[PDB]
């Protein structure tokens, strides 16, 4: 089997991407944030504290003939940005882009933090990291991908995120029309439960490539590119007037600037992030200070190849017995 679904930016900045997902019988379609940095499929629901729902579409298990309470199971998750959610668990039929999994754990939120409430466009998350990170207790649950894997034509999914435009998540096949040149594959460590890999270096604009190992995670659920302070300082030093602002929470730059590109290495291959992808616009409405899309990972504890990086590539998440990651230009 295979699946193919379009993923759409939630706003004009590509802050996140939503993908329609069918849950239950008859189908209830919710728009979920596919997150390769976590491993829980959770939804706003009829059980979510009413004051914490503001415009989201909810899953109502009592209206699904295939929903079953997973008795005694609870979940609770905290994300890198400080947001969180928790609740109980149902199993139900879940379909993405025509690919159906029966018996998928659907984690129903009883509580969500303010950032979730305030984002009316995101109805929940669909985790695509390794199932070892799944938070369901006392019986850990599998991700949608892990449940689907055996049925897939090939044990892979691909992320093809757009810049200010829709893109695609495919399951079970590699669309050879969706990228240019060849795909370069690189080793993955699953030791921390992430799609963790080592970039071979970077360049700023038209500058020389610096060969240096940068361990990080491919994370579709993180907006920006978070890299070591040395690398980030080298990038922003090429933008007149750019500075790190403790008050704002990272590097800012004059909105009148033209940003240089940023290149990262994948083996001997190179992925180029155009400068425009690094512009996250005014820090507040009407400001002439703009927020940068490359930020320091210092104090996160891990480097994160988030959407800024991933949307410059066609990315293969190869879930074979020995997982790997592939990157192609597009």
UniProtKB/Swiss-Prot annotation:
The active site is at 35, 199. Residues 17-328 form the Peptidase A1 domain. The keyword Disulfide bond applies. Keywords: Aspartyl protease, Disulfide bond, Hydrolase, Protease, Signal, Zymogen. It catalyses: Hydrolysis of proteins with specificity similar to that of pepsin A, prefers hydrophobic residues at P1 and P1', but does not cleave 14-Ala-|-Leu-15 in the B chain of insulin or Z-Glu-Tyr. Clots milk. GO terms for biological process: proteolysis. GO terms for molecular function: aspartic-type endopeptidase activity. Disulfide bonds join 255-290. It is an enzyme of class 3 (hydrolase). Its EC number is 3.4.23.22. It comes from the Eukaryota. Belongs to the peptidase A1 family. This is Endothiapepsin. The gene is EAPA. The chain holds residues 90 to 419 of 419 of the full protein.
């Amino acid at each position: 089997s295979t699946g193919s679904a379009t993923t759409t930016p939630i706003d004009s900045l590509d802050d996140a991407y939503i993908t329609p997902v069918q849950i239950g019988t008859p189908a209830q379609t919710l728009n979920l944030d596919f997150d390769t940095g976590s491993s829980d499929l959770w939804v706003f629901s009829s059980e979510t504290t009413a004051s914490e729902v503001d415009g989201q579409t909810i899953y109502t298990p009592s209206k699904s003939t295939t929903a079953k309470l997973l008795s005694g199971a609870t979940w609770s998750i905290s994300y890198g940005d400080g947001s969180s959610s928790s609740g109980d668990v149902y199993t139900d039929t879940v379909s993405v882009g025509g690919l159906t999994v029966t018996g998928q754990a659907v984690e129903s939120a009883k509580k969500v933090s303010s950032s979730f409430t305030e984002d009316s466009t995101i109805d929940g998350l669909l985790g695509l990291a390794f199932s070892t990170l799944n938070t369901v207790s006392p019986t850990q649950q599998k991700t949608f991908f892990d449940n689907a894997k055996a049925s897939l034509d090939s044990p892979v999914f691909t992320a093809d995120l757009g810049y200010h435009a829709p893109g695609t998540y495919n399951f079970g096949f590699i669309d050879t029309t969706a990228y240019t040149g060849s795909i370069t594959y690189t080793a993955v460590s699953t030791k921390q439960g992430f799609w963790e890999w080592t970039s071979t270096g970077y360049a700023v604009g038209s500058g020389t490539f610096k060969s240096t190992s940068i361990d990080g995670i491919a994370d579709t659920g993180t907006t920006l590119l978070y890299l070591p302070a040395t690398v980030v300082s080298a990038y922003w030093a090429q933008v007149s007037g750019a500075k790190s602002s403790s008050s704002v929470g990272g590097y800012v730059f004059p909105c009148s600037a033209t940003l240089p590109s940023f290149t990262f290495g994948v083996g001997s291959a190179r992925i180029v992030i155009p400068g425009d992808y690094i512009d996250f616009g005014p820090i507040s409405t009407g400001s002439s200070s703009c927020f940068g899309g490359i930020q320091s990972s210092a104090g996160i504890g891990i480097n994160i190849f988030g959407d800024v990086a991933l949307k410059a590539a066609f990315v293969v998440f190869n879930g074979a017995t020995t997982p790997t990651l592939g990157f192609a230009s597009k």
